[PDB]
């Protein structure tokens, strides 16, 4: 298999400031948030997946369940609740952030050694290419 379990370093980061502006978060958040770049790390035992991100600035840790509906509560980032479903179309991953907005949701996929993810929010598609450093 492809076993998502990996170490993904951040190479790029596009339209990330407008993405925070689009989600209407605070100015102090965007001041600190830009100069930073979090290193992602994926862990998956089987039908349980834990998405670990490690920054000394507010740990962004998420847990998930594949094929089973997910719910989420945020109080530090654009404090919204959405209904999210993580599934496997084929050999990729997708998430439908079912809530407000016209364009909410992320798209995942693997291009061998690099991720080609896309993140939208109110119509602003930002992208972040990572480099699997396994």
Are residues 118 and 107 in contact, defined by beta-carbon separation less than 8 angstroms? yes
Tokens coding 23: 């989600």
Distance CA 91, CA 75 (A): 32
Are residues 120 and 105 in contact, defined by beta-carbon separation less than 8 angstroms? yes
- Domain span at residue 101? 1-134
DSSP 21-85: HHTT--HHHHHHHHH--PPEEEEESSSEEEEEE--SSS--EEEEETTS-EEEE-SSSTT-EEEE-
Please name the method used to determine this structure: NMR
Q: Which residues contact 121 (CB under 8 A, 6 or more apart)?
A: 19, 22, 23, 78, 101, 103, 104
Are residues 104 and 94 in contact, defined by beta-carbon separation less than 8 angstroms? no
Are residues 36 and 55 in contact, defined by beta-carbon separation less than 8 angstroms? yes
Are residues 95 and 78 in contact, defined by beta-carbon separation less than 8 angstroms? no
Total domains in the fold of the chain: 1
For 3, 54, 55, 60, 115, the CA distances from 112, given in Å and listed in that order, are 12, 23, 26, 25, 8
Tokens coding 114: 């690099």
Residue ranges at the known binding site: 40, 62, 108
CATH number at residue 105: 2.40.128.20
Residue ranges at the known binding site for all-trans-retinol: 40, 62, 108
For 1, 4, 43, 91, 134, the CA distances from 46, given in Å and listed in that order, are 12, 10, 9, 15, 19
Q: 5 by DSSP, 3-state: which?
A: coil
Q: Which residues contact 48 (CB under 8 A, 6 or more apart)?
A: 63, 64, 65, 66
Distance CA 12, CA 8 (A): 12
């Amino acid at each position: 298999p492809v076993d998502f379990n990996g170490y993904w370093k951040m190479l790029s980061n596009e339209n990330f400031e407008e993405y925070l502006r689009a989600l209407d978060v605070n100015v102090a958040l965007r001041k600190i948030a830009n100069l930073l770049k979090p290193d992602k790390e994926i862990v998956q035992d089987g039908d349980h997946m834990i998405i670990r991100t490690l920054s000394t600035f507010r740990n962004y840790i998420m847990d998930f369940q594949v094929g089973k509906e997910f719910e989420e509560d945020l109080t530090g980032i654009d404090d919204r609740k959405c209904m999210t479903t993580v599934s496997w179309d084929g050999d990729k991953l997708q998430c439908v952030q079912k809530g407000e907005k016209e364009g909410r949701g992320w798209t995942q996929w693997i291009e061998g050694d690099e991720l080609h993810l896309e993140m939208r929010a109110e119509g602003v598609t930002c992208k972040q290419v990572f480099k699997k450093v396994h």
